A paper describes a structure:
A key component in the generation of cellular metabolic energy is the F1Fo ATP synthase, a biological rotary motor that converts the proton motive force (pmf) to adenosine tri-phosphate (ATP) in both oxidative phosphorylation and photophosphorylation. The enzyme is comprised of two rotary motors, termed F1 and Fo, that are coupled together by two stalks: a central “rotor” stalk and a peripheral “stator” stalk. The Fo motor spans the membrane and converts the potential energy from the pmf into mechanical rotation of the central rotor that, in turn, drives conformational changes in the catalytic F1 motor subunits to generate ATP from ADP and inorganic phosphate (Pi). Here we have used cryo-Electron Microscopy (cryo-EM) on detergent-solubilized cysteine free [name] ATP synthase13 to probe its structure and understand its rotational dynamics and coupling.
Focused classification of rotational State 1 highlighted five sub-classes, here termed Sub-states 1A, 1B, 1C, 1D, and 1E; with resolutions of 3.1, 3.3, 3.1, 3.2, and 3.3 Å, respectively. However, comparing Sub-state 1A with 1B-E shows a ~36° rotation of subunits α3β3γεc10 (corresponding to the F1 motor plus the c-ring) relative to the Fo stator. Importantly, this rotation describes a ~36° movement of the c-ring in the Fo motor without any corresponding rotation within the F1 motor: the α3β3γεc10 subunits are rotating as a rigid body relative to the Fo stator, with the movement mediated mainly by changes in the peripheral stalk. Sub-state 1A was in one rotational sub-state (here termed Sub-state 1’), whereas Sub-states 1B-E were rotated by a single c subunit relative to Sub-state 1’ (here termed Sub-state 1”). Thus, across our maps of [name] ATP synthase, the rotor (consisting of the subunits γεc10) was observed in four discrete rotational positions relative to the Fo stator: one in each of States 2 and 3, and two in State 1. In State 1 the un-stretched spring corresponds to an Fo rotation angle in-between two of its 10 preferred rotational sub-states. These two correspond to the observed Sub-states 1 and 1”, which have similar quantities of stretch (close to 1/20 of a revolutions), and therefore also energy stored in the spring. The maps presented here were generated from material imaged in the presence of 10 mM MgADP and all showed the enzyme in the “autoinhibited” state, with the C-terminal domain of the ε subunit (εCTD) in the “up” inhibited position interacting with the F1 catalytic subunits.
Author numbering:
A (entry chain a): 4 to 269
B (entry chain X), C (entry chain Y): 1 to 52
D (entry chain H): 3 to 69
E (entry chain L), F (entry chain J), G (entry chain M), I (entry chain Q), J (entry chain S), K (entry chain I), ...: 3 to 79
H (entry chain R): 3 to 78
Amino acid sequence: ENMTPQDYIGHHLNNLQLDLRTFSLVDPQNPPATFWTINIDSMFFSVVLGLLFLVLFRSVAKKATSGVPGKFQTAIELVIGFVNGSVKDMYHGKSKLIAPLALTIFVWVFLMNLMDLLPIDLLPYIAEHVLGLPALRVVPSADVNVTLSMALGVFILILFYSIKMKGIGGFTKELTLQPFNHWAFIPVNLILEGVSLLSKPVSLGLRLFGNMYAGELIFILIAGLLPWWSQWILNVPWAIFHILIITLQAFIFMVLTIVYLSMASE
Amino acid sequence: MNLNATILGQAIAFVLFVLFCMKYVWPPLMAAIEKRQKEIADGLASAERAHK
Amino acid sequence: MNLNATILGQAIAFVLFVLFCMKYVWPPLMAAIEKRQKEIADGLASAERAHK
Amino acid sequence: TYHLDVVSAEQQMFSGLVEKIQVTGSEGELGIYPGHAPLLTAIKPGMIRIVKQHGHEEFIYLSGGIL
Amino acid sequence: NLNMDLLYMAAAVMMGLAAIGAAIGIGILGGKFLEGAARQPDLIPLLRTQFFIVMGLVDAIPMIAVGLGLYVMFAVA
Amino acid sequence: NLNMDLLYMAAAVMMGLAAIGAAIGIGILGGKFLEGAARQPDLIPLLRTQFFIVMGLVDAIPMIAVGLGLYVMFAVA
Amino acid sequence: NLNMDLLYMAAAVMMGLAAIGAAIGIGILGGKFLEGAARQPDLIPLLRTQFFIVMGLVDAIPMIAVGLGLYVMFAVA
Amino acid sequence: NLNMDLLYMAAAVMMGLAAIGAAIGIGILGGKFLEGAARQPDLIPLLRTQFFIVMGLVDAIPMIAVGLGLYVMFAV
Amino acid sequence: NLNMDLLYMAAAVMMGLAAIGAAIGIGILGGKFLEGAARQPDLIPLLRTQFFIVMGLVDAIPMIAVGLGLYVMFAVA
Amino acid sequence: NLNMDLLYMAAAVMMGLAAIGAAIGIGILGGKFLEGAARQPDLIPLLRTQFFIVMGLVDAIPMIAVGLGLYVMFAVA
Amino acid sequence: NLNMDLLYMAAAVMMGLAAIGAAIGIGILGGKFLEGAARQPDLIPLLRTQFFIVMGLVDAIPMIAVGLGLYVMFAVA
Amino acid sequence: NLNMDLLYMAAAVMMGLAAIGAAIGIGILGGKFLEGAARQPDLIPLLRTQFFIVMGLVDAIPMIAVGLGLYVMFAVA
Amino acid sequence: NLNMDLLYMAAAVMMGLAAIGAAIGIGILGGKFLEGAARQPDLIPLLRTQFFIVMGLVDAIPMIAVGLGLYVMFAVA
Amino acid sequence: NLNMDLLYMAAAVMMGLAAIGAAIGIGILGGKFLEGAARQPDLIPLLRTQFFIVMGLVDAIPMIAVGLGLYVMFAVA
C-alpha cells in the first residue's frame, strides 16, 4: 500500500459521485466534465441528519406534558428557548415561516459540522474495505454546493419578503434612490444595491464552507505526517478549539438569516 | 470548486425538511411550552386576585 | 508507508479528545438541564401552593 | 434660548432665559449653546459669561461648583 | 513548475492578508467587548451574545479569502 | 500558457486587499456599537438597526472587488 | 502576452487600494456616528442626514478608481 | 511592447494611493465633524462651514495625483 | 533550481503576516483586558476567562496560516 | 523606449506616497481643529487662524515630493 | 548559487515582520498596563502579574517566525 | 543606463517615505497642540513655543532622507 | 552580484522593519508613560522604572534583527 | 558594474523605513507631552525633562539604520 504522505493527503479531497447521465461512479483519477455528477457522500449523509433531526424532535413533540419535563425534554425545551428567544428579539412580523426555519438551519448546520469531530480516515476505511467503492469524505458542510444551495434558498425568501411586504413600488424606490435619495446618483445606486444583495448569500455560504473546510484539512494533515504515536498533541488541541467554531457557525448562520429576512420584511 | 447539480438537488431536501418541521413539529412544541408558561402566570395572577 | 499506524494515532488522539469533554464539557451542559428542571418544579409547585 | 439656573447651598444667584454661556470648565474653557448634549463637569473658580436674551452680556463670579 | 511556484506564492499572499485583516478586526471588536463587560459584568452574557452576533461579519471576506486561497493551494495547484 | 501564471496571483491580491479593507472597517464600526450598547442597553435594538443600515454601505467596494476578482480567477482564467 | 496580464495586475492593485480606502474611511466615520447616536438617540435622523452628506464626500475618489478598474479591464483590455 | 501596459501600472499606483489618502483623511475628519455635531447640534451650519473649508485642503495632493493619473492612462 | 526558492519566500511572507496579525490583534485585546482589570480588579479571573474566549476566535485564522506555512517548508519541502 | 518608461513609475511612487502623507496629516490635524471648535464656537476664528500655521508644516515635505515628481514626469521625461 | 543566497531574503522578510508585530503589539499592551498603575499605584504588582501572563501570548507566534528564520540562516543556508 | 534610470526609483523610495513620516508625525503633534490651545486660549503662545521646540525633533530624520534624495537625484543622478 | 550584494538588501530589510518596530513600540508606551506622569506628578520614578522593565521586554525581539542584519552584512557578506 | 543600483535601493529602503518609524514615534510621544503640558502648565519643564529622556529610545535603533545608509551610500557605493 504505497500511500505517500503527499498522496494520502491528496486522496482525501475526493468525493464519491455518480454520473447523472451514465449512472457511473466517477473514478478519482479522471474527473468527467459535466454539471450532472451528484456528490453522493455529502447528499445521502446530509439527509441522514435531515431525518435524524425530525426523528429526534418528533419523538417528544407529541409526548410532552406541560408538567415537570424529563431530562431529554429539558434539553429540547432549552434549545427551543435559545432559538425563540433569539428570533423574538429581531423579527416582529409574525410570519410563521421564519420561526421554524431558524430551528432547521441551526440544528441542521450544527449536525453537519458535528460529523467532522470523529477521526477522519475511519469512515472511509470501513466504506472502502468492506463496501469497496473508491471514495469517501464525511462532512456535508465542507462541500460548497450544500452551502450555496442554502444561500440561494434564503435568497429566494429574501426577495419574496421584499415583494410581499413592500411590493414592487417600494422595492424599486429603494433600489433606485438609496443611499443618496436624488436622481443625479441613481445610475450608480442601481449597481450597489444589487451587489449588496448578492453578497449576503455569497458570504453566508462561503463563511461556513471555508471555516469547515479549513478545520477538516488540519486533521487531514496531521494524521499522515507526524510519527503516528505523536499525532495527538496537534490533533487534540485543534479539535478542542474546533468545537467552539462548529457551534458558532450554526449560531452565526441562524442569526444572520433572521437578520436579513427581518431587514427585507421590515 | 467545480460546482455540481447537487446544488440543485440539496435545495429540495432542504425545503422538504422545512415544510415538514414547519407544521409537524413547531406549533406542537410551541403549545407544549406556552401552556406550561400560562399555567404559572395564571396561578400567580389569580392568587393576587384572591389577596386583593 | 504503513496504513495501520494512522488508525492507531487517530485512536490515541480521539480518546484523549473525548476524555476532556466528559469531565469539562458535558457536566456543565447537564448542570444547566438540572437547573431548568429544578426551575420548572419550582414554577409549577409555587403556583399550585398558591391555589391552595 | 434655554433656561439657566445658578444656585448654591444657601441661595439662588440667577434664573432666566439665555442665548449662550461661557464657562471655564475644570478640564478647559467651554461654551454652551442651546440644544447642547447632556454634559457634567466641575468648573474652576472664576467668572462666567451670560448673554441674556436680546444680547445683554453679564458677568458673575463663581467660587467653584459643578455644571 | 515555474507556473506552480507562483501558486504557492498566491495562496501565501491571499491568506496572509486575510490573517492580518481578520485578526486585527476581531482584536478591536473583542477589545470593545472587554471594556463593555468590565463596565457591566452582569451584562456579560448579553454582550457576549452581541459580540458573536457581529463578529460573524468581520470574517465575511477573510474566510472567503481562505476559501479560494486554500482551494487553489490544493485543487488548482 | 503564461496566462495561468499571473491571473491566479492578480486575483489573489485583488481579494486579499478587499479582505483587509472590509475586516478593519467592520471591526472599527462594530467597536463603537459595542461600547454604545454597554453604555446604554435597551437602546440595543435601535443601535443594531442603524448599525446594519450603515454596515451595508461599508461592504460595497470590498464586495465589488471580491466579485471582480473571482470573475477573473475563473471566468477570465 | 504580458500586454494582457499586466493590465489585470494594474486593475487588481487599483481596485484593492480603492477598496481599503473606502471601507476604512466609512468605518471610522460610521463609528463616530454610532457613538454620537448612542449618547442621544433622539437626534438620530439629523446625524444620519449629515452622515450621508459626508459619506458622499468620502466616496468621490474611490468610485473614480473603481470605475477606472473597469475602463482598464474592458477598454484597454 | 512594454510601452503600453506598464504606463497603466504607473497610473494605478498613483490612483490607488490617492484613493487611500483621500478616503482615510476625509474619514477621520468627518468622524470628528460628526462627533462635534452630536455635541452642539444647533451649530451644525457653522461647523459645516468650517468643515468644507478645512476639507478642501485634504484633497489637494490626491487631486494632483489623480489629475496626473488621468493623463498617464488616457493621453499615453 | 529556481523552483525551491518561492516555497521559502511564500512561507516567509505568510508567517510574518501571521505574526503581525496575531501580535497586533491580541495586543489590542489585552490592552482592554488590563484596562478592565485595573478598573475592577476583584473581577479579574472572570474577565480573563472572557479574554481567552475572545483570543481563541482571534487566533483562529493566524494559526491556520502558520500551519499552511510550515506545510510548504516540511510537507512540500 | 527603454530609458523613459520606468521614470513614469518613479514619479508614481513619489506622487502616490506624497498624497497619503498630506491627506492623512491634514486629516488628523483638521480633526482636532473641529474637536476644539464645538467646545468653543466663539474661538472658531482664533483657532482657524491657528490651524493654518501648523498646517503649513505638515504639507512642507509632501509639496517637495509633488514638485520633484512633476520634474521627473515633465522636466526629465 | 542564487537560491541559498536569496533565501536570506526570506528570513529578512519572515523575522522583520515579526519584529514589528511583537514590538507594536506589546507597545500597545504595555501602554495600558502603565495607566492601570498610574490609576492604582497600590495595585501595580498584581497588574504586572497578569501583564506577564498575556504578554506571552502576544509574541507566541513571533517566536516561531524568528526561530524559523534562524533555521534558514544556518540550517538551510 | 540602468544604473542611471534606477536611481530615480531610489530617490522615490526615499522621498515618499520621508514625506509620509513627516506628515503623520507633525499632524499628530499639531492636533494635540491645537486641542490644547482650544482648551487654554490664554496659553496659546506658551504652547506654540513648546510645539516648535518638539517638532524640531520630528523633522530631524526626514530632512536627512530628503537631503540624501536630493543628492542622489541631482548630485549624482 | 546576486551572491554577494543581495545580502546587503535583506539586512537592510531586517534593520528597516525593526527600525519601524522600535520607534513605534516605544513611542506608544512612552506617551502613556508621560500622560500617567502628568496625572501623577509624584510618581515619576516608580513609573519610569516600570517603563524601563516593559521597555526592555519590547525591544528584546527587534534587537535580534538589530544584531542579525549586521552579522549578515559583515560575516555573511 | 550593473549592481550598484541595488545598493542605492537597499540604502534608500532602510533609511526610508527608519524615517517613517522615528518620525511617527516622536510625534506620538510629543503629542502626549503637549497634552500633559496643557493640563499642568507649571510642570512643563519637569515633563519636558522626561520627554528628552525617553525620546532617545525612540531613535536609538533608527539612528543605526541611518548611519548604515550613509555608510553604504558614500563609503561603499
